[PDB]
Amino acid sequence: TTTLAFIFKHGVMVAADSRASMGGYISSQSVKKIIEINPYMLGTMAGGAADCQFWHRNLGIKCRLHELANKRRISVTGASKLLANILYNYRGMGLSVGTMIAGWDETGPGLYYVDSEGGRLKGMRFSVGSGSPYAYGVLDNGYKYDMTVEEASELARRAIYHATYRDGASGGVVSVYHVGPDGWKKVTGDDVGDLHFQYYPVV
Amino acid sequence: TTIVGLVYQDGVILGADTRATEGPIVADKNCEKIHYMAPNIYCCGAGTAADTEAVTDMVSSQLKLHRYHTGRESRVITALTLLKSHLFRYQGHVSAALVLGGVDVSGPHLHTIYPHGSTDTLPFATMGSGSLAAMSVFESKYREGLTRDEGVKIVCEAIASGIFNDLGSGSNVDVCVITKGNVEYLRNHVQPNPRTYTSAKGYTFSKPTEVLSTKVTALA
Amino acid sequence: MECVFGLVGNGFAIIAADTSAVNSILVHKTNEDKIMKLDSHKLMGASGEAGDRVQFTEFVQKNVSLYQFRNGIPLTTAAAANFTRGELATALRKNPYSVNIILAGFDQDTGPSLYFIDYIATLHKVDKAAFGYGSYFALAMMDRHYRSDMSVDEAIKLVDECIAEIRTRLVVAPPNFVIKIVDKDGAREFAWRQSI
Amino acid sequence: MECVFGLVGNGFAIIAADTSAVNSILVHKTNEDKIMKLDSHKLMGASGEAGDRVQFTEFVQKNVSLYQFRNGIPLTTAAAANFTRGELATALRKNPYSVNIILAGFDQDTGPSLYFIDYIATLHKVDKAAFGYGSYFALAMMDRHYRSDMSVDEAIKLVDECIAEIRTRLVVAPPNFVIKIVDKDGAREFAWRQSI
Amino acid sequence: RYDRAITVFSPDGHLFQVEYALEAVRKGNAAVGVRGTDTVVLGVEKKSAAKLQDSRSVRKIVNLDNHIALACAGLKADARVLINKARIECQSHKLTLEDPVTVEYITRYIAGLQQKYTQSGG
Amino acid sequence: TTIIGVTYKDGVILGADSRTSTGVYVANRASDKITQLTDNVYVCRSGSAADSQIVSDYVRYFLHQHTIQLGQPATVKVAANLVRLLAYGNKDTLQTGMIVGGWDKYEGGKIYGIPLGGTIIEQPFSIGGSGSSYLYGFLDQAWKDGMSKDEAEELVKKAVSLAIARDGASGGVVRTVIINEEGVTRNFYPGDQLPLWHEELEPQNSLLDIWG
Amino acid sequence: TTIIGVTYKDGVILGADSRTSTGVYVANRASDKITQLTDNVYVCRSGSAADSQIVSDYVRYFLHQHTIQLGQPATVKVAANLVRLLAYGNKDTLQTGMIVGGWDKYEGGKIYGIPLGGTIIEQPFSIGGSGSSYLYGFLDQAWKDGMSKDEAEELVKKAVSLAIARDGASGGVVRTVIINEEGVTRNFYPGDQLPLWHEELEPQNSLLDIWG
Amino acid sequence: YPYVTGTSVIGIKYKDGILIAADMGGSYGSTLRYKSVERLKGIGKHSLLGASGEISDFQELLRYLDDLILYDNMWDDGNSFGPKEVHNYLTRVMYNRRNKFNPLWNSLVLGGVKNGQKYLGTVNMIGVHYQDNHVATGFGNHLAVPILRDEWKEDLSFEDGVRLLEKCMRVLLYRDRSAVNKLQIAKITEEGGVTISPPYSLKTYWEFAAFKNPTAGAEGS
Amino acid sequence: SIFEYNGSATVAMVGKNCIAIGSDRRLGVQLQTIATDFQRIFQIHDRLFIGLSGLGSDAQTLYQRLVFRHKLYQLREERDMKPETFANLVSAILYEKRFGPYFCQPVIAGLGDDNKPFICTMDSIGAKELAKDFVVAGTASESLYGACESMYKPDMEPEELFETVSQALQASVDRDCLSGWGGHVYIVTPTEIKEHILKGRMD
Amino acid sequence: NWSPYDFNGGTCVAVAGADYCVIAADTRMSTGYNILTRDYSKICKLAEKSVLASSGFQADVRALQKHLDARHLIYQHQHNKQMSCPAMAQLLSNTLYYKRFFPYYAFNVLGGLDNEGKGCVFTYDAVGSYEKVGYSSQGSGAKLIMPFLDNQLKSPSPLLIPAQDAVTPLSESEAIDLVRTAFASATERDIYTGDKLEILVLNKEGLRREYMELRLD
């Protein structure tokens, strides 16, 4: 799999593929790899699918109980640290979760990368999965802080597509999300089978 | 696989199913598992295919050369001993295992050969995955002096048992009857399980299947 | 891999540590600050697993701040280092932490003080230290031009030289380093060393 | 560990490679030039165990030179690549060399070419190639910006970008890369990318 | 383990143990807090400075955190247990969520602990 | 498996059990574990089937060559030493244990036990195969030197049947081979002819003949 | 180790060897492997010397509690089932064969084999230890039902000495216990009193007696 | 590890009842230590089961089932476990003890007739279970289910049932090397109850000319 | 293992008097996609084609070695080698290395004699699988078996055969992560050879 | 030494539609290369609108089915309501995951109508992840069924933002026929599938069971 995110002027983008592959076989290509933890927060699936799904339901439940108890919506830092601790209690258990937590706090955007062994990073651009190398290869070239929303989304699509092209385990629809002051909205999903021949026209 | 050998009053009957698999998937629905070695010798191969065809073919060629050299008709003991001498010296690494049968100056012969060179002489033999399913039938119904039709019936029953009761072997039954002079081989004697469905209307290939290039050659 | 090394100068102490954050073969972040202000006058540079590093250093900071509140008078640097060693030793045979610790701090009366603690808890008041693969170059350099009364500017020149050698002679040379100093006026960050 | 990659322009085939020779953690040398010249019109970048890399590359150069003088006409690039593949594949099952090879060349009647030869001896005439951990970044960036008609300025800009990314994102990022170009004039050294 | 309902309802529906806890509070050192536009001034009445009392080591107004300060009234011995629990949980909140506690969160936590003690047995 | 050899006044009475197994399955129920080397010498094959069979073949081949060269009936001692030539020569590969018995004008009936590993031991009798262990105690109190062809035959039948009744690896029909001055005499004793030992019942066609 | 129990017309006669070995060194050459569990019941200890005796101790303790609470001597069945309790509940920790024998006024002299794993099999006679293989055939051939004391004891002696003679791990004396209505009796047979089997010579104080 | 283990236990639902057969052997590695270990038991009023595999574990399952059935009987409320409930309890216990990595090493064949509905089923050492007209365990699952499938009939007589079951058991006796000639057939029927055949041995045939003389010659063989 | 070091998908299928052989088009270290234009199908002569799935290097070696032997047969015998004979030759030269085997799973297809199709694939040590409806090899073995079993018909014109092999190969490769990136299908008839390159998913 | 698991084979298929859902699986159990029984039903009706079809290890499959019946009965009793299909789907995901470190060896496929009446299908793996789909297959013959099912029943992934329409849903009879052809062509080429086909069609008028005789070898 290959997933990515990056903060820029107008918020944080998150882009991901849609390909679940076990061994050498394509289980499916409709797997939704961007989990919405909260109308203002997105969690990204990578590594183990069962682990990511279960622990993101747990995280969503903890966040909802937090909203109920404190009458205020939890921040991105709080959710990231919650997940990091929860995972750290199982460090030796062989969990395979690694996921970006992307959201818009009360204090501007946020993007953290959490890991199956309690490794938590606050960063400005991330990419995770077996296709991370190409995601960085493309993302770092076009990335600029002030690039507008349209070209930011285009950059996320291009990065995920290139990870898809050079990677066996990454493919399917390219989902891209935009997290901003008014919550998050899905911007695009484009099947790579058509995205490719959009990018390198036959002629 | 299921391969079988029975010595009836006049000669030796060999039998085998026709399924060949590569793991849990049947590669070949109709395999040829009874092999020719000489005008009076045939053998059903079990174990590693490549090895069985290689060894049976090598022995067939050696036996033909000896037939020329001596002129007279080759006998089964020769094939058995050549197979032993080849299989042993490779210490079972060549994993060919056969049921070998024929009719000679001395009369019907039936042997089982195992990858290490251990051989047996038997009235009834079975090998392959369904060897137990076949040996059930043999230990229940075999007797001395079966006539050709009863003997072939029993062999077909054994192979059907080794088809329906074991997953490794299936498909259709084949048989080779080795009497004194004539070897009556049946390419597909019993087809007991036809195709259960017709598929009604053939399914259509909606996607027109886009193609990028087409080199074409005007072959003479 | 995470390289950190320390030093005790005239009336201060200096901890430097690379700031890359690496997965197997990938540099997710080249800005990871690995030296925490354990206290107004203490620093704790650590080197180990990322999860173990963060969790353990945060735990020790929890205990330090709790002590400061509970008694009014902050833990002295020797006490903080001994507490860290005690905790790491007690965890050694139950659920080991894999972090190596360098703790520096200025204690109003004694003066500067660097302390070396290893994955297996071994503390030693030392006037120079180093963890990671860059420890070889760090220690060789320091032993070469170090002086017990070596001032701020010259100590930092030495630290720059150690950084440059680590960055030019290690196969896994990390690009960026952070230099943190601690003296009468409390722990601080001394200029970041960008390389990219 | 080595990184190598290639690029085929309109009339040139660039090859770049890291120039760091190491043992375990020490960069015994950062000027180790790894892109060989087989002929006046061939380059052969290699990656793999240093001893095997050198021995195999020298063996292949011996055979290329022997062919040249004996017949009077030099081996064409495709034939040189196929000969390399044959020798490597024959050694594969008897005393394998652990070298990965990228072969570029120019022939007046065919133009620039770049061959992919893996240590398993798989040969393919690739448009763009790369070996080692830097392969991911190199390939992704080339794919993103590659065209089939690049001016040497554009190709060198692309190689510079690939080098910068490989340094920024790898942990074993080597600091120095060499860039060699093959054109109608002949195999040549384009530029040296000092970082340190 | 000693479990018995120390706090039970009296015929009139009152919790005589809680009412007696209030009585104990009403006899403790008076305290006052006032909230300002930009400051929150607390205060308390200590027992005679001329009396040979060294107050250097214990402060009647205490910090549960660098952002939260607490004053008690009633049993001085119990105040210490509350303070320790509150401090520990304040740092724990810092440690599980990166943020420090709000005032209302810690108030709620302290009150919840205090109530729990009024219903558990023994 | 079981293989026993008994020496009586005139010669030998080599024995076997007839059960070649490949695991828990009985691949063959009437295997012939006694083979000819010359008209007067036989070997009780035991252990690996392939190895014992080929050692039998090679000994028969060498011993044909020898008996033609001398033009004279080969002796038992020479047959045993030839078996050892290959048993010892190939300790690594051949996992075989054998018993060689025969008859000569020179020395009479002799039994040479070539256990696993390749020793030759002339013995009054030999026991081999996995079914041997059930017999040491019985034979030690049974062996009487200098028996007739009869008493020796009964003793060999008892030994092999007792090993059969109690050993998983040994069963089927008892085969015996009486080698003497007049020559080899091969016999065949199904289970039905063998006695019935501790807690065994008389075979019956169907329970419908008794009911239950 | 060789341990045997045989039932006769009025009781049982358990018998065992005496050799504890730590490799190829006989650590104790007069070991006592027939441990009492009650006036009625003795149990022949096999397998590891720790497990067998600790099980024996625990079942002694249980029989002491049970007989007092009940007020009657403990049956043999109860003793066998108590041994089985331990040997089975600790199936995964204990490595010990056992043979429980005795006489009790209800079911008379009885024997319960309890091999590894704890399977109480009531038997007319049982055998355990390494030295049982050599006796399987002899006792299929030799067992009789309802012998008298002398016949059963002599069979036990013959069987155990036959195991001693061919078994590396069995040797020394032969101890037998004759549990019977009139009470227990323990006999001791040095190697000297035991018969001589195939390939054994009379003992001799020295060679200067024979050679000279 | 399995120490004293038994072998195949075939099963055949016949008219008016159920028949189960199992040899009386308990083997110890290769040796047959025991040859008279009744390995069929009657459970409750309506049931009957045989076991294969470790004989210690089987004897324990008998204790479990005896407590179960005695506790069931002492109620005297007029309802009891038929074959179905007993087999379901057996599957549950076997699976539960597999979940502890401490398996009962046995394979159970349990069958019986209640209220005119005759049940027959099996359980593995790891909880695998199925109910069928004819079941077997161990080699009876290779060398006997072929012949059972081939020849079983809807309304098999009692004598035809015995003769089929002996055909199967004899075929095993020829080629199992773990089986002893002693064996028992157990009959369970409505209103007759369980009835276990006395031990007996089956006549066997060996006098085939090919066996007497492998190959053929006046000297060799 | 070593067979899926590169990953391939090859199919052969028999029409009326035409034969069709298809294949994938990508080279990969394992999941790296070095080249989307690899050749697994080689023409040895008109009416005889060999597909060499499995390890790429073994494939190239066997192809060059086979060309050597076939040309020398043309010079010595003056007849192009008949399909079945070529299959026997390949089986022999694969079995010669019985204990050093090439990791190839060749597919052999070609018209001959009275314009009569021939198809067979072989074990890595030459066990031939002479079939008559269709043959499949590579990493997409199971998927190709299903697709062809569900899509085959007994006697098929060249155009129906092309469409069916194309759909089978593409639908069967889309369910495989080590294969795809286009396709390369031949329709060989006793008067014409059509070599098609297909539009595939590049992910 | 024992193994705690066994591949008992079989295959399952599910095909949802406008107002129905076709969970269909084979009837076979195999341990190695011998058939245990030819009548092992793999379909389990868990609720009036849910049907669980599982393949893999039979003991685990049946333990899971019984556990889900228990949990659903407790649900019914506590809430006085029958647990909708998506609720069953998430419950089964959770129950599979809770044994994360000792997983059920069961490859599951739900089916049935969501509360409004549109058919669903949820595909799982042994660890517990799941995803609503329009069709699915699991078991020994899944890899052979899926290529064909994909090529005839294929439509834009629901993640394309300007949604690009979908194929007209095969009506019920087309779906039954497609499942039948899938199992015929799967039992033709796979050894662990056959001996019967159990088709279960869940619809507004209730569920129906049908059968098709696959070959016996």
Author numbering:
A (entry chain e): 56 to 258
B (entry chain p): 40 to 259
C (entry chain d), D (entry chain r): 1 to 196
E (entry chain E): 3 to 124
F (entry chain o), G (entry chain a): 14 to 225
H (entry chain g): 19 to 239
I (entry chain q): 2 to 204
J (entry chain f): 7 to 223
How did the manuscript describe this experimental structure?
Arguably, the most important component of the UPS is the 26S proteasome, which makes the final decision on protein fate and catalyzes protein degradation. It is a 1.7 MDa protein complex that acts as a multicatalytic ATP-dependent protease. The 20S core particle (CP) is given the proteolytic function and consists of four stacked heptameric rings. The two inner rings are made up of seven different β subunits (termed PBA–PBG) (Fu et al., 1999) with three different protease active sites (PBA/β1, PBB/β2, PBE/β5) hidden within the inner chamber.
We determined the first plant 26S proteasome structure from Spinacia oleracea by single-particle electron cryogenic microscopy at an overall resolution of 3.3 Å. We found an almost identical overall architecture of the spinach proteasome compared with the known structures from mammals and yeast. By contrast, we found a significant difference in the functionally relevant β1 subunit. Unlike previously solved proteasome structures, the C terminus of the β1 subunit has a 20 amino acid long tail that forms a new contact to the surface of β7. In higher plants, we even found a highly conserved tail, which may indicate a motif for an additional binding partner or act as a signal for modification. A small yet significant subset of particles (7%) showed a 20S particle compressed by 12 Å that has less density on the non-RP-occupied gate. This flexibility of the free α-ring is reflected even in our high-resolution structure, where this α-ring is less resolved than the other parts of the structure. Although we could resolve the 20S CP well, the resolution was limited in the 19S region. We found a total of 30 pores in spinach, 25 in human, and 12 in yeast, ranging in diameter from 4 to 17 Å. We suspect that this new conformation of the 20S core protease, in correlation with a partial opening of the unoccupied gate, may contribute to peptide release after proteolysis.
